[PDB]
Every structure is written in C-alpha cells, then in structure tokens.
Amino acid sequence: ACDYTCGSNCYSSSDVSTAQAAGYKLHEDGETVGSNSYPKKYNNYEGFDFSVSSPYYEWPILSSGDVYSGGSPGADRVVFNENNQLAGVITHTGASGNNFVECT
Ligand SMILES: [Ca+2]
C-alpha cells in the first residue's frame, strides 16, 4: 500500500523519511539545489492542519525514489519544520497554479 498518495504517486514512510533527511541537511548547511532553490520556506496559506509548529520548509520528494538533486522537481513536496519534525506531504497535482492539496 501507499503511506502517502499524491495524485498517482505512491510513497512509503521510508521514502518520506529519506527525502526529509536530505532537505533538512541542506537547511542546516544554508544550501539549496535546483533552479527554484529547495528547500524553501513553506507558507501555509491553504491552512492544512499540521500538528507540528512553523516555520515550515518544503522539499521535493520524487516519484522515482531518488533524492532530488536538481532538474525537474515534479509536483510533490515534503513539508518539515525548523526542528526536523514532519509536518506532511503535499502536492500541486490537481490544484490550480500555486495551490497545494494534501497527499492522501
Ligand atoms: Ca518508493
């Protein structure tokens, strides 16, 4: 089964854990990767019920299972906070322009 489903993408807890670890390390190092510069600050304008406190940061999680290294980031993102706590997994799949919907 999928622990998280973003549109047609299936993710296991292992996959979110791995993506989060990479994003958080970049966060600690003050570094970013890709043309859009990830990890970047996540603003919760959609008002998703996370039980972890802000600030929040978004990092791409890839359907391939590969850790994001540049190139196309796809539509899915792992949201983590300043204390390296997982807030959730979101996606642009099925949302107009910059809206996000939560993975199921
Ligand atoms: Ca996987």
Curated annotation (Swiss-Prot):
Disulfide bonds join 2-10, 6-103. It comes from Aspergillus oryzae (strain ATCC 42149 / RIB 40). The keyword Signal applies. The keyword Lipoprotein does not apply. GO terms for molecular function: lyase activity; ribonuclease T1 activity; RNA binding; RNA endonuclease activity. Belongs to the ribonuclease N1/T1 family. Its EC number is 4.6.1.24. This is Guanyl-specific ribonuclease T1. The lineage of its organism: Eukaryota, Fungi, Dikarya, Ascomycota, Pezizomycotina. The active site is at 40, 58 (proton acceptor), 92 (proton donor). Monomer. It catalyses: [RNA] containing guanosine + H2O = an [RNA fragment]-3'-guanosine-3'-phosphate + a 5'-hydroxy-ribonucleotide-3'-[RNA fragment]. GO terms for cellular component: cell septum; hyphal tip.
